[model samples]
Target: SMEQVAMELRLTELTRLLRSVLDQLQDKDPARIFAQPVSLKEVPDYLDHIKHPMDFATMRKRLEAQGYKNLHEFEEDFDLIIDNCMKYNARDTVFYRAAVRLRDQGGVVLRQARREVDSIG
Candidate 1:
């Protein structure tokens, strides 16, 4: 099945990502920040009404933080998200949704969540 194949591929990427995360956590510097929390639950609402090319820095930061602690885990989780998108046949939509979520969850500084809507074709 195409869906299954995609899911497996995405899962592999995620697994690779997760392993990196775990390794990072294992050897964490201890003096730096562990993770930067982010929540994008409300991003969709704003995306429904707004634009694109959002700041993305905060979301990237949050993801980076997670990767730093355990890249592989985040990669796996991220692939899980991609898998869900494959199951739904809405990869682009799902990706945009996630971009919004990450932006919203990260912070209000860049308004990243709202920007993606504008950027997409």
Candidate 2:
């Protein structure tokens, strides 16, 4: 019970941090990266089912250490296919889509980690 509470606390804080980032980037459509839509209301549910292929905890800690306060802070370093496409002057390419994929994956990781904690508890 205590473990579950602690895990939930961690997840709550983690989700808050994520929402802060997403809120800052609200003008940009990161969900385009996944070809899916992510709305403020659906974010928590959205995080539940997405496919994420990296270490969730590691990524979370990475964001925490970076003192995440804005999407620019995350995107500047998180440039994956998105940055590449933008760099080559292909703004119409999959750049925004890829960015969303990363963002959504991070959410999914945190949500799934929360699930794992609950299951074990």
Candidate 3:
């Protein structure tokens, strides 16, 4: 089940990452818009083009390009979430819980996502 564990870990990592990015986008006091804007016109094709899960740098770049001046702060916060997710998500139930939480909080940001970053490992 190690492979399954790895897969779940990967998913959890990505979910947490995206969730933080989305959360930053919705922070009422301050919003972090993506480099290209978080709109259907940009996201679907960009997600398809990015066939790999995003890293902190890439996420920051994308956000910065869209006018997010505080990408560095979001990157640090996102890394914290990913670290916690990787540490705690060693089982299936954790993945489900993480996914559910992300969906509840981030669905608007990612609802129309059509393709996952193709990963093989």
Candidate 4:
């Protein structure tokens, strides 16, 4: 319980840190930071579209690049993306599409993988 609470706190901090960094960068170089303007695509029904899942290879590569050696940490990050997307009304964005797919596969799958990895140690 304490570990989960601590994990949640750290994840919240990570979220704030990420937002701050993005804000600072965008402010410094508005155009250069985001060359392409983010626009919401018009979909009759976002639920009707099934997004392709992020393959394990690509997900692992991205996670490792972010210094997430622990499966649990990476899983938490994935969940945070999903939660934040919904929480901030970013559900129409491309990033949110990817997050939806990741969320679909994660939770249980990630926990099992984490257990297997830890058992190997």
Candidate 5:
């Protein structure tokens, strides 16, 4: 069994890390495209393009529900949102460009979290 106190500490750490990553990405996404779920009606054939759609809105719901067990889970959602955007949108598309920029920033923010959480790591 996991140590209750130890787990609690890590959970708190995870929450902060998640928030930091989200804050950075949210700030970068000024167009608010990634802020919510992609509408299939707006972007036709979206379901066909992205098998696993991810958005910050859904991610936050999962976050509030304590659905994430670790920072990596939060990272995965970040990656998913970028991957879905880049995969579905072409190089000429702004969505693709935004995802690229967001990914680079994601790496920086995630690294900071990893360094800060070294105690439990």
Candidate 6:
């Protein structure tokens, strides 16, 4: 019982640290284009082009449910957010470069968060 409690505490700490990685990514996007799901109505071909769609809103839902079993799982979703953006936008455009920025900063944030999560264990 006590051990169960301990594991739960560790998971809670892990969740918060991982969430900070997400929050920082949003902070970098002032236009907030990447803040939510890409609108299928506006861009009818979005679904035709991209698979494994992801957004901050979706990630936030998963995080709240403790869907991320480990740091790598969370990192997968984080990278998906950037990689998906990169796939949808041209390199000369704002969204594409924004994803590039996220790739850079998100990597740093995830590294630090991983260290914190590893310490929690």
The root-mean-square deviation over C-alpha atoms between each candidate and the true structure, in angstroms, is 16.1, 13.5, 17.5, 12.9, 2.2, 1.5
Each model's lDDT comes to 0.38, 0.46, 0.42, 0.45, 0.83, 0.83
Please provide, for model 1 over 45-115, each residue's C-alpha lDDT reduced to its tens digit, 9 standing for 90 to 100.
44343322122233344454433233333334433333333343344664445544543333342243224
Ten residues in sequence with the least summed lDDT for candidate 5: 112-121
Q: Write candidate 5's Cα lDDT for 30-88 as tens digits.
A: 88879989987888888888899999899988877767888778888988999999888
Model 2, 49-72: lDDT tens digits are: 433322223335656664544444
TM-score of candidate 2 on Cα atoms, chains taken together? 0.31
| Candidate 6 per-residue C-alpha lDDT over 2-121 given as tens digits, one digit per residue, 9 for 90 to 100 | 999988887887788767777887787777877789888988898888888898899999999878878899888878888888988899999999888878867777678778777766
Query: TM per model?
Result: 0.26, 0.31, 0.26, 0.36, 0.85, 0.89
Candidate 3 at 60: error in angstroms?
Answer: 2.5
**Ordered list by lDDT, greatest first:** 5, 6, 2, 4, 3, 1
Error of 5 at 115 (Å): 1.3
Model 1 segments more than 4 A misplaced: 29-121
Candidate 6 at residue 62, lDDT? 96
- Sorted on TM-score, highest at the top, how do the candidates line up? 6, 5, 4, 2, 3, 1
Instruction: Report the candidate with higher lDDT, 1 versus 3.
Output: 3
lDDT of 2: 0.46
Backbone atom clashes (below 3 Å) for every candidate: 19, 3, 4, 0, 0, 0
Model 2: worst 10 consecutive residues (lDDT sum) = 50-59
Tell me the deviation in Å of residue 99 in model 2: 8.7
Clashes of 1: 19
TM-score of 1: 0.26
